[PDB]
Symmetry: C3
Subunit: 432 residues, 3 copies
Amino acid sequence: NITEEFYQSTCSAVSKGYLSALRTGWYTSVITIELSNIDAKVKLIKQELDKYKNAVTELQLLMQSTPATFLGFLLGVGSAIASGVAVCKVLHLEGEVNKIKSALLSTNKAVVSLSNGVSVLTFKVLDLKNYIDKQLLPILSNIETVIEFQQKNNRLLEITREFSVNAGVTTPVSTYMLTNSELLSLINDMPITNDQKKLMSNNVQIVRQQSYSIMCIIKEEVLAYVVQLPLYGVIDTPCWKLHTSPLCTTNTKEGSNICLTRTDRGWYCDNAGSVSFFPQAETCKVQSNRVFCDTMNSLTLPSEVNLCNVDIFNPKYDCKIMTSKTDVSSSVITSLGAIVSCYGKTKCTASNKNRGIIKTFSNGCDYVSNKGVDTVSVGNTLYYVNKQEGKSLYVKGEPIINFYDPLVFPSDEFDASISQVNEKINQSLAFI
Amino acid sequence: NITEEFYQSTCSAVSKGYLSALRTGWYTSVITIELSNIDAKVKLIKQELDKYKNAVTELQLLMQSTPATFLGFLLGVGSAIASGVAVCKVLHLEGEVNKIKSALLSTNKAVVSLSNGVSVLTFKVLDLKNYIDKQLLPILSNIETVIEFQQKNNRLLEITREFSVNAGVTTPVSTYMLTNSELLSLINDMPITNDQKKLMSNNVQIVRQQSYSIMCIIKEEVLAYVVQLPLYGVIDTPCWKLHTSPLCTTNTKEGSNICLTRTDRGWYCDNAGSVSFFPQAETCKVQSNRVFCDTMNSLTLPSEVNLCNVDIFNPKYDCKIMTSKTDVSSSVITSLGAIVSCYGKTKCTASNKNRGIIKTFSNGCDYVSNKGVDTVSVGNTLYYVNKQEGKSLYVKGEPIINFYDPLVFPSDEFDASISQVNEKINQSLAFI
Amino acid sequence: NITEEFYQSTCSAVSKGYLSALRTGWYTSVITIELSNIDAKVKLIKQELDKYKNAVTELQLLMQSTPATFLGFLLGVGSAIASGVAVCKVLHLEGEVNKIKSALLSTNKAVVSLSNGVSVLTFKVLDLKNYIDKQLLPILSNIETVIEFQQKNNRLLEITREFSVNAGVTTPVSTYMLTNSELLSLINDMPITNDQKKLMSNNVQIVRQQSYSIMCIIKEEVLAYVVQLPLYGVIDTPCWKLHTSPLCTTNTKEGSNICLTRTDRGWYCDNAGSVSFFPQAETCKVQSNRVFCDTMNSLTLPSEVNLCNVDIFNPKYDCKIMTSKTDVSSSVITSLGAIVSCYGKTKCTASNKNRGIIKTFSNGCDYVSNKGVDTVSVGNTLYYVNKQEGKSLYVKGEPIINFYDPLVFPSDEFDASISQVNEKINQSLAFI
Ligand SMILES: COc1ccc(-n2c(=O)n(Cc3cc4cc(Cl)ccc4n3CCCC#N)c3cnccc32)cc1OC
Ligand SMILES: [Cl-]
Ligand SMILES: [Cl-]
Ligand SMILES: [Cl-]
Ligand SMILES: [Cl-]
Ligand SMILES: [Cl-]
Ligand SMILES: [Cl-]
């Protein structure tokens, strides 16, 4: 059940009904490929064997160094593959690769305890040693062997291609790195809750986009790369999306108008007694009513930040805004409708596909729901609205920009707030 | 005929002679692939059949949810695939896929009227049902069949790969989604003007970059994805590119200087009596003298915005600037030359490849055309200039930063304008 | 030897010990592919020949036009492929392609002098003319020829695929454009120093990411694309990375606090008597202790900018800061530790994997090294620290935010500095 409320007073709208899936941690698995030491049909086999050798050499040469890779400016700075790189660094210690090679001798999956105590799931996805030693060495022939060897070697060649243009670190994790069944069985044998396994298994395409593949080591006929998978430690909490657009006065004299915009737009999810706030567009991914975000791109805020939607002048949280005199027209397409900021001479309308223009917006900030509306036009820009089913509520209220004296209004404030704007107005009213 | 003018007074330059091709709308087509229900040569065929089945399963599991995906901060916010997703949602209604399956029984292209009245062009690009049922079922053999089945199945495997790492939505649209001849014949059978067909057909690589492929439904042996193609409703209007760079005073005492920069840089195209303004770099693509832009990334401005180039103090449009005291050196490579903002101790030169340094810039903002100039250097940064043919005109004029008293100059104004700067100066001159 | 210093007084940290590799120029090579003019086994060959012809046609149609493609806002604007496009433009002049075709008749590599004097290295990587004329024309059969022709043609098909979704300009340069051995031998036959050859050869994956492939011309059975490779004219100079985080007062009354942040974070490298400053995250790539940057994304600053780390009030360089009252909590993961900006009610801790929480941060800006620390948590965000070996030094000092009177503190200054903040404070203290 997705619902939406538009606040006429602040030119903003909140879409709720979403459920969280936040990446809070990382799981590191070690994916291995076992390697071999080494007429027209034999010629094709030798050409494919050369492609095999060059791929090994290319990956060997690849890792002569350590692997590396409105309110967004308030975010901190993480190191996204620090956990995977740390595991990879452990794999270079003496005897470490040999432990993995021994654990996977009689099975393709095994949990191995690394020397520093880290327990990682290991996975041998391709045994090229067995194939080359048992099927190709006796030759050095028929066409079926040529075809089969090309099929088996192709995956190594494609993994190498990906690492070669990504400096050894890829994201999203492709099906060459981990096929769909491999990833599913990895998730299944992963030490996580039943809710997490079901969530990851039903959203593998999102899991791939939030994962990293880190080329790690070639040693003792073992090719190992670390696949860093997301841990969703927050699931099924309420989330809501805040959409904001400029609210300006609408006086006829050009340049005499003042504007404010709520700057706190983005995704919000309840999380551990606080609210995780994701300011940056497209750092969250919506699947139906589930929203996948990454806490690395969030601020942790008091839950009172939500009061800004119902009462922007509330005394418990100082709601953030920016101010200007740039009254240009635009639209913000919401989850269930469209906010329209129409100023000046701009033509602003809403239309249905079958009937055409059904509403002409007057100057100011207004809203239409997606029920019976297919597009909105603001100036020369046509916007298609989202056709998701859900109820919108229009909350009438006097635009708060009307409460300000333009003669003392502080414009060109970007990182401002209700209180900071009051503070500056008081200082200007004092000097006069 | 590309031409350029440099305005010494405002440290800016305008390149004109370009012709518009603006994406104003979207066309949605439905691309279908028909699917089949299901010794060494048979073993290779069974391995390829398993890859076929796993791809179907992977795509089935992929769509258990709804598909989703200086002055730029003034732009609105659209929902780029809202139109395609709406069409995809219609394809899930009962009987809808069956209509497409029936329309394409005896032909690979057909226009189908969907239940909600939407008329979409449909296209069956691959009949794997016919191939597997008529060529592979009788077996369950020779090597040529193995090769042929791998060739036909590969496209399904690659489409699936693309969707798997893009969560079901890809852009640009690859030749696996729509081959070049397929796209060309799609454009040809598209209900659009002759000018649009010629424009799209001669610029298919740009059409691909402005299109989306949306994985939609697998149902009744039909795989359908929606290809959302750009509609160019504005073509062949004049466009011009505005380049700007900081203009600072050049006093010797460090820190005593003041700067302004025109913030209205970007692409401008005449459009329907107004001007479409594209502030963000690389949201427009230039092909010779044709500039492809997307109106979703534009403001719609009065045509008087153009007056800022010839007279930044004009009374009809309030030209936008930012102010600072950060007099750092840089260059802006224009269409036909280079703007050089040289301040402090920076070494700023222009060179020809055969002769070396031909000009040393003094402190201030200056310009050289690309005629006889191959590179400019500002500090430790070497810039190659564009070698496009065209005439430059140097418009001499006193740098407007000289008209300001630094003691009342308001610096650190980002979203400012000529008038707002005058307004603040008047208030500062009043208190004194 | 990577080392790090944390400055408690300014909530910042400098990581040093790195060595530079800066792209300062471009080298343009011309890569060519020689082309041919043109039962179940012959049917597969004819299908592959059609894919060959369509690829040629697609590339012909592709180039009917000219090829094109905190403090970051201070950077200039370059034209990254201006040098390659200029070389490509020369290849269209009459007789130019014929010179390359003649130079490569008896050898696959040759230096050619173009008509405008430009000396380019040329490279024929694939002779499809010889293969089709000598192996396929006599037929118009066996399965080995079908397999071999698919192998040879595949590279042309993949190059075309890359150009088709990139509008003729790709970066990174893939192994289809230039295989690893091809690139290595290109570097080896390149007219550059021994240090550059060793540097490029040991970091080919970075070379690929800093290179462009520009589809140029199909003419006289020759397919030519220009590969624009980086020239590293600055190597082995000291580089250091500056990390910064907000420094706020910690009074209990919400909203009464003031903040400043050093805005000069990014990479710094000594360069030709000045310092190249790279403000933008991830425009530099670190390989062990070598940092690859691009001077196009740099400012050239006086070396005195370094004084801001030891003495932010130094009289020789005016250190840049931003000011606000937005005291939100976050962390910055450094090279060898973590800066923690903890304000309000936020829970801020540091943990070891084996023992859990070992330190709880109090309000203010603080730091922990990565020795014995695996993660830090600030609010709902868990950060893994980098586990690189190296020594950290904690430089104690009074937070400089304590020196400011909040009643006259100018907040919401983004492009500010120590002196500009003093200037504004003096004007506010004068009116009172
Ligand atoms: C990507 O889209 C965006 C574009 C701009 C903003 N944005 C800011 O960051 N600031 C703060 C600020 C004030 C200031 C003063 C001067 Cl003298 C110079 C640089 C200044 N900066 C940073 C500018 C960075 C760039 N370019 C803004 C202040 N007013 C309006 C918009 C602002 C936000 C965006 O995210 C939606
Ligand atoms: Cl979203
Ligand atoms: Cl929707
Ligand atoms: Cl451009
Ligand atoms: Cl050019
Ligand atoms: Cl870095
Ligand atoms: Cl590290």
